[PDB]
């Protein structure tokens, strides 16, 4: 296209053409816009584009073109500044300075092109970071001088100073070396006295609102780092808390400034400072009540109306109040003349807490937590806040969210629990009254009764037992009455669900009253027949929730009972669970398992277990007899579903019973593994006959579900087994025979990652006991799984993750298995680990880095033996270089800490002489050369070739520092971070690496 003409640098740049491409990009659309976008990027990324920046900034009439010219210059200044001839550096400075001056002198430009000026100011700051103060000592003195000659220049200078402060103190950490950052921080500190004098003069005298605002914006930044004396020994707090709170223009920024002052470093023994801290709070609260809104104002309504900047202001007020009070409210609590101030401030917070805005509520709630926790512990404080706390009880109760937003509920619960301790009588009264208004209909709704029920449920365990007992009887009887009142299943379902929720939240009450507990459970069993949407889930959820807390009362024989209630549940389990979906039935069986495990008589426990599993065991026996007679019957989708649900039932019970499940596992184990084999053959047969697409079909997915559930069942038991002799002697050999060769000899798309997961648990638990078993696992899954996942980073994501979890535990528990590997396979192992380094996937990268570390340790533990010596000769520098690569390539930032740890471990091996043999070949360096010397040499050469723009001195200084620091991780990492900064630019200072010492 014609637009592409600007990409030809042999010809002079046609500014008119540039402006057209830019205009097409920003104001155009569609294909035109897209083409222009690609042209502009190519233009900007031309390494010689910066030379044409002055032409653009002078001769262009498009402010966007000039913006892009400054972006191009930014790139140059940031990365290649010290590469330029000195004349160009001076030339660029003068040009940028001159450009800013002229824009500020033109009132029309100054007001209409704020974006370009801000960009120009930022560009100036990039030059300052390079040049100031060592080659620009007069900058601040001259800045202050020029400020008095024009309001526009003064204002713009405040923007420059703001950005400078930001780049030096707020955003230097990851953009400069430690040494350069400290240099610039010290530099600004040295000259801030002058800067502050200017800023204060403007605030005290200035009348230009835009000037004052910019000045306050810069002050906000300063408050992040300046000495407290600048704030407290001057008159500036008076100005902030009075003058600038009255005008809405300055109000927003001033409030933000005062919030930061509430975070200034202060001594707490100086009584004069304390009075000043009280004073600016008093002034600020006075201005709000007089100029903005009284303490009685409906802030909920105001916020909802969302006029102008009201929402941001109320947000900022919340941050100010909570910040100040969390630190300084003790200053207001003793002096009686300060009591009204204290309570007015908290009353504003009460009003702010009624606002419908999730994130703002969390901010205020965090403060309330801070408050009530203090009142709970600190003597003689709670009586002060009685009226505040009473209001807060209502606010939190009325805004209670669903418990299941989970984090918010827990935070609300925590505060309300404190508030209940602080005044248990007031809390009860509020809740009972709240409930009374549900009953008279004044506030009745499904939402409202739910909210109230969550609130009531949240304070269980706060009252002493007898106190608690009286409360819950009242609530439940009241809820029971409310249930009668309502008509239609819709309404009664809601109230009934809330009844069961509250009861489920008060197990202490249930444990003390067996007859009531029994009645609740039998009522839950009735609900399991109710098809009304949600009722069956609610019944099952409540059942297992109550059982988890009260299980002991199901396993013992209660007074006036002929038997433990667990027997009674099991006797009629078929009827009870008849209308439940499979997943709900499993929950039911799982709950029964929880109870059975509390039976410590082994004979009785097993009897209960056999009785519980009667229905699934009988179904199991039948289909094992049928499906073995006719393997075709196993193709029946109904039978496959029945089989899966039987195994799932076993998984559910095994989950709650763990080690105690073993007798039931024994009943099914051998036939289960045979079923695994039979299903495996069917899957393979279907893939052969239909192709890979077979794996997508409901038939095969159903079959593989059987395999996955079988693996899950075995994994679940073994992870919880206490008798490891039985696991090894009885379970493991049949398991491995059943799953390993099937995995190995299936095509990739038919392999279940769950096999790897199961093996991980086996190695974890009993790996140390089955050394030959571990070898067999590796032989069967290692190479074929590696070949699935070593062509890219995306395919077979589950196999990928489980693969490195398995290697990690094998490396941990049975390292000997890797020693038995033939040389070629061990090389694949090393390759696999490095492959994991290069993943952006955290679930792989982390384990890969951990395997590498554990491996180096494993090798180290071997001492001076042939295998360790060969390992270092073969793989030491491979791990060093691979680790360095992911450290420096800017695409694995998430793994930095573990990368650094691994690198430090590797370097420390050499500088502790823990590597016995020479890491170099006999001909490479002279005989007798230490591995220390050769390591520095290897690394220096490696970094020279990988980062050719670094000087030899940079590389040498970096490696000298890094080497010296290989015992101090924190400092070591600091040196690495400095290196990562320096490779991004030209001409980094080698002495930066002396920062530590």
């Amino acid at each position: 296209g014609s637009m592409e003409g600007i990409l030809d640098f042999s010809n002079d740049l046609d500014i008119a053409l540039l402006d057209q491409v830019v205009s097409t990009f920003y104001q155009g659309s569609g294909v035109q816009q897209k083409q222009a976008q690609e042209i502009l990027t190519k233009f900007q990324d031309n390494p010689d584009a910066w030379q044409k920046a002055d032409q653009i900034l002078q001769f262009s009439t498009n402010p966007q073109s000039k913006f892009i010219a400054l972006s191009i210059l930014d790139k140059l200044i940031t990365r290649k500044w010290k590469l330029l001839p000195n004349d160009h550096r001076i030339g660029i400075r003068n040009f940028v300075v001159g450009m800013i001056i002229s824009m500020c002198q033109d009132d029309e430009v100054f007001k209409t092109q704020k974006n370009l000026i801000n960009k120009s100011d930022l560009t100036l700051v990039q030059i300052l970071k390079q040049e100031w103060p060592q080659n620009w000592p007069e900058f601040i003195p001259e800045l202050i001088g020029s400020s008095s000659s024009s309001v526009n220049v003064c204002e713009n200078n405040m923007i420059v100073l703001k950005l400078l402060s930001e780049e030096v103190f707020d955003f230097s950490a990851e953009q400069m070396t430690q040494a350069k950052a400290l240099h610039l921080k010290n530099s600004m500190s040295k000259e801030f006295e002058q800067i502050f004098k200017l800023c204060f003069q403007v605030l005290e005298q200035g009348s230009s609102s835009s000037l004052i605002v910019a000045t306050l914006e810069s002050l906000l930044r300063y408050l992040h780092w300046i000495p407290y004396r600048y704030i407290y020994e001057t008159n500036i707090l008076e100005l902030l808390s009075t003058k600038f709170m009255t005008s809405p223009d300055t109000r927003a920024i001033t409030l933000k400034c005062l919030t930061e002052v509430s975070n200034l470093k202060i001594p707490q023994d100086n009584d004069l400072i304390k009075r000043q801290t009280v004073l600016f709070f008093q002034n600020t609260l006075q201005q709000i009540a007089t100029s903005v809104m009284p303490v009685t104002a409906d802030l909920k309504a105001t916020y909802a109306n969302a006029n102008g900047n009201d929402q941001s202001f109320l947000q900022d007020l919340a941050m100010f109040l909570t910040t100040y009070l969390a630190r300084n409210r003790a200053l207001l609590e003793s002096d009686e003349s300060l009591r009204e101030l204290l309570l007015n401030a908290h009353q504003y917070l009460i009003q702010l807490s009624k606002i419908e805005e999730r994130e703002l509520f969390k901010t205020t709630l965090d403060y309330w937590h801070n408050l009530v926790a203090d009142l709970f512990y600190e003597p003689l404080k709670k009586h002060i806040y009685e009226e505040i706390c009473s209001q807060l009880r209502l606010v939190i109760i009325e805004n209670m969210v669903r418990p299941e937003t989970i984090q918010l509920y827990k935070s609300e619960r925590e505060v309300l629990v404190y508030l209940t301790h602080l005044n248990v009588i007031d809390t009860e009264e509020i809740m009972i009254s709240k409930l009374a208004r549900q009953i008279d209909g004044s506030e009745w709704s499904w939402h409202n009764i739910n909210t109230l029920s969550w609130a009531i449920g949240s304070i269980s365990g706060t009252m002493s037992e007898d106190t608690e007992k009286r409360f819950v009887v009242t609530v439940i009887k009241d809820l029971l009455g409310l249930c009668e009142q309502k008509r239609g299943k819709d309404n009664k379902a809601v109230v009934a669900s809330d009844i069961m929720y509250v009861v489920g939240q008060y197990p202490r009450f249930l444990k003390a009253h067996w007859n009531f507990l029994r009645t609740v459970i039998l009522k839950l069993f009735e609900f399991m027949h109710e098809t009304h949407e949600g009722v069956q889930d609610m019944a099952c959820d409540t059942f297992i929730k109550i059982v988890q807390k009260c299980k002991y009362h199901f396993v013992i024989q209660q007074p006036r009972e002929s038997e433990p209630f667990i027997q009674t549940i099991i006797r009629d389990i078929q009827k009870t669970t008849a209308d439940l979906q499979p997943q709900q039935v499993h929950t039911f069986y799982k709950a029964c398992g929880i109870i059975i495990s509390e039976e410590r008589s082994v004979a009785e426990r097993n009897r209960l277990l056999s009785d519980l599993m009667q229905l699934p065991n009988m179904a199991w026996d039948t289909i094992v007899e049928q499906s073995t007679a006719n393997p075709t019957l196993l193709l029946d989708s109904e039978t496959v579903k029945i089989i899966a649900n039987i195994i799932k039932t076993n998984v559910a019970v095994c989950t709650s019973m763990g080690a105690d499940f073993y007798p039931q596992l024994g009943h099914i184990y051998y036939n289960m593994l045979q079923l695994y084999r039979a299903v495996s053959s069917m899957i393979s047969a279907q893939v052969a006959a239909e192709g890979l697409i077979a794996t997508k079909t409901p038939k095969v997915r159903g079959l593989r579900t059987i395999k996955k559930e079988i693996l899950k069942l075995v994994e679940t038991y073994i992870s919880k087994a206490r008798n490891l002799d039985d696991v090894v002697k009885v379970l493991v050999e049949p398991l491995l025979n059943a799953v390993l060769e099937d995995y190995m000899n299936n095509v990739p798309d038919a392999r279940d990652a769950e096999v790897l997961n199961c093996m991980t648990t086996v190695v974890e638990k009993v790996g140390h006991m089955i050394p030959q078993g571990v070898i067999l696992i590796l032989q069967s899954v290692f190479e074929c799984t590696l070949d699935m996942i070593n062509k890219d980073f995306t395919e077979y994501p589950e196999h990928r993750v489980e693969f490195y979890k398995l290697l990690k535990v094998i490396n941990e528990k049975s390292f000997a298995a890797f020693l038995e590997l033939p040389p070629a396979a061990f090389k694949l192992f090393v390759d696999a680990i490095c492959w994991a380094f290069k993943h952006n996937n955290r679930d792989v990268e982390v384990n890969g880095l951990q395997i590498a570390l554990d491996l180096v340790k494993n090798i180290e533990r071997m001492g001076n033996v042939p295998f360790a010596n060969e390992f270092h000769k073969n793989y030491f520098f491979i791990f060093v270089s691979e680790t360095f690569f992911v450290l420096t390539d800017s695409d694995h930032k998430s793994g930095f800490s573990k990368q650094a740890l691994l690198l430090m471990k590797l370097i420390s091996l050499v500088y502790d002489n823990k590597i016995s043999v020479p890491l170099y070949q006999e001909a490479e360096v002279p005989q007798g050369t230490s591995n220390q010397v050769y390591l520095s040499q290897y690394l220096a050469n490696m970094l020279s070739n990988a980062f050719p723009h670094l000087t030899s001195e940079q590389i040498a200084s970096f490696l000298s520092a890094l080497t010296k620091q290989c015992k101090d991780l924190v400092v070591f990492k600091g040196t690495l971070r400095d290196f990562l900064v320096q490779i991004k630019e030209v001409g980094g200072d080698p002495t930066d690496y002396l920062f530590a010492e």
């Binding site: 029971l480 009934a496 009531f516 029994r518 009645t519």
Partner: peptide
């Protein structure tokens, strides 16, 4: 019938 909680009431009054 299903949502008749009278059983809960009687057990609670019995306390």
């Amino acid at each position: 019938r299903t949502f008749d909680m009278h059983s809960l009431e009687s057990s609670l009054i019995d306390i």
